[PDB]
């Protein structure tokens, strides 16, 4: 039967070669993972969390990783898999290196060359990965375009899921029930998915630009939402609006979003209007 792949790594066994970026949970480095007793040198990304932690707190992280990072059994092509973890005065997470970066930077850098087929396919892929997370009862809590990574321009993967349940704030991506009462469910992830789609359709525009984070809940209560992106027909915008209903049970399911976006992906020029398709 299918085994649980996550590995506990020694401080040796992997090396950090260059800083890649970040300033949110920690610092990401590109490096090599040399599994002891083997002859492979695997290129990996290493996230070293900024908080300190203790040997007792590290055991709680280990207990959470055993419940969490293990019950992602078959794997999904659109979900990043945690290859290893090393807890020793710092918390370090090891995944396969993705040289092409995040989808947020990609859509900003290629604004003038992105077609409707690519945009709709990324929506399909993100929903497939999120549906897989829902099947394994894992709430992401931080779905955003910065947390979607580019394997190839035709293949994206979700990363950084459950990085809050591991031990113990993106207001403009959060559902109203998350802002007000810190309630997080697969349906609050659907809201964040809708904001992520908006990010892609606006080529990486900042949601609610120039509006303070303290004002978002009162704007959502008033009924205001993110505007219809220029390339979006009413069809795609309606899906986004459904993701942002106050009633979490009235929002789409990731399983329904796979079907809607896959239908739109079959005839993309009908749903997105881009100068150059
Ligand atoms: C462009 C956006 C940006 O600046 N960032 C995105 C974010 N980031 C990027 C990477 C990464 C870069 C290159 N190659 C791969 C990944 C990561 C990242 C690095 C190392 C580990 C890591 O783990 C995420 C994760 C995966 C799976 C699980 C968890 C966490 C928790 N559980 C339970 C899992 O199963 C991600 N991060 C920051 C910056 C660089």
DSSP calls for the chain: ------EE--STTEEEEEEEE--SSEEEEEEEE--TTS---EEEEEEEESS---HHHHHHHHHHHHHTTTS--S--TTB----EEEESSSEEEEEE--TT-BHHHHHHHTGGG--HHHHHHHHHHHHHHHHHHHHTT---S---GGGEEEEETTEEEE--TTTTTS----GGGS-HHHHHH----HHHHHHHHHHHHHHHHTTSPPTTTT--GGGHHHHHHHT--PPPPTTB-HHHHHHHHHHT-SSGGGSPPHHHHHHHHHHHHTSHHHHB--TT-
State the helix-helix crossing angle for 254-265 and 116-135, rounded to 10 degrees.
Answer: 160
Q: Is 156 in the pocket of ligand 1 (CB under 6 A)?
A: no
Residue nearest to atom 1 of ligand 1 (CA): 102
Residue nearest to atom 27 of ligand 1 (CA): 82
Q: Quick one: tokens of 3?
A: 């085994």
| Residue keyed to tokens 């992997």 | 14
Torsions phi, psi for 3 (to 5 deg): -85, 160
Active site residues: 142
Q: Is 162 in the pocket of ligand 1 (CB under 6 A)?
A: yes
Q: Which domains does the chain have, with CATH numbers?
A: 7-96 (3.30.200.20), 103-271 (1.10.510.10)
Mutate to test the pocket of ligand 1, among 95, 96, 104, 167 (most ligand atoms within 8 A of CB): 95
Q: Quick one: tokens of 262?
A: 């896959």
Mutate to test the pocket of ligand 1, among 45, 96, 97 (most ligand atoms within 8 A of CB): 45
Please say whether the dihedral angle defined by the alpha carbons of residues 222, 180, 169 and 132, taken in this order, is positive or negative. Answer: negative
Contact of 275 with 230, CB cutoff 8 Å: no
Q: Terminus-to-terminus CA distance in the chain, angstroms?
A: 47
Q: Which of 167, 220, 194 is CA-nearest to residue 60?
A: 167
Q: Cα separations (Å) of 262 from 98, 153, 204, 209?
A: 25, 17, 22, 30
Q: How far is the CA of 103 from the centre of ligand 1 (A)?
A: 13
Contact of 93 with 82, CB cutoff 8 Å: yes
d(CA 261, CA 182): 29
Resolution in Å equals 2.1
Quickly count: other Cβ atoms within 10 Å of residue 71's Cβ: 11
Q: Is 72 in the pocket of ligand 1 (CB under 6 A)?
A: yes
Q: How many residues are given for the chain? A: 277
Contact of 260 with 254, CB cutoff 8 Å: no
Contact of 103 with 54, CB cutoff 8 Å: no
Residue nearest to atom 26 of ligand 1 (CA): 82
Q: Which residues are annotated as a binding site for ATP?
A: 20-28, 47, 95-96, 160
Quickly count: other Cβ atoms within 10 Å of residue 154's Cβ: 11
d(CA 192, CA 82): 22
- Which own/partner contact pairs does 103-110 have at CB distance under 8 Å and 24+ positions apart? 103/145, 103/148, 103/149, 103/150, 103/156, 103/200, 104/144, 104/145, 104/146, 104/148, 104/199, 104/204, 105/204, 106/150, 106/153, 107/145, 107/199, 107/200, 107/203, 107/204, 108/203, 108/204
d(CA 277, CA 273): 8
Contact of 190 with 134, CB cutoff 8 Å: no
Q: Quick one: tokens of 128?
A: 């497939």
Contact of 193 with 257, CB cutoff 8 Å: yes
């Amino acid at each position: 039967p299918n085994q649980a792949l996550l590995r506990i790594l020694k401080e040796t066994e992997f090396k950090k070669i260059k800083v890649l970026g970040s300033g949110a949970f920690g610092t990401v480095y590109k490096g090599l993972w040399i599994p002891e007793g083997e002859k492979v040198k695997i290129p990996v990304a290493i996230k070293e969390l900024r908080e300190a932690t203790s040997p007792k707190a590290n055991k709680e992280i280990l207990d959470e990783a055993y419940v969490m990072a293990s019950v992602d059994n078959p794997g999904n092509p659109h979900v990043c898999r945690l290859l290893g973890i090393c807890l020793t005065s710092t918390v370090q997470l090891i995944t396969q290196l993705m040289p092409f970066g995040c989808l947020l930077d990609y859509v900003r850098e290629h604004k003038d060359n992105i077609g409707s087929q690519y945009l709709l396919n990324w929506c399909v892929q993100i929903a497939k990965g999120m549906n897989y997370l829902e099947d394994r009862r894992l709430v992401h809590r931080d779905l955003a375009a910065r947390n979607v990574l580019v394997k190839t321009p035709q293949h994206v993967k979700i990363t950084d899921f459950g990085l809050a349940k591991l031990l113990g704030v993106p207001i403009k991506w959060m559902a109203l029930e998350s802002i007000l009462h810190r309630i997080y469910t697969h349906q609050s992830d659907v809201w964040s998915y809708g904001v992520t789609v908006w990010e892609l359709m606006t080529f990486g525009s900042k949601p609610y630009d120039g509006i303070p984070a303290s004002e978002i809940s009162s704007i959502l209560e008033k009924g205001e939402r993110l505007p219809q992106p220029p390339i979006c027909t009413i069809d795609v915008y309606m899906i986004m609006r459904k993701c942002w209903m106050i009633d979490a049970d009235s929002r789409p399911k990731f399983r329904e979003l796979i079907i809607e976006f896959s239908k739109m992906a079959r005839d993309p020029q009908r749903y997105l209007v881009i100068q150059g398709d």
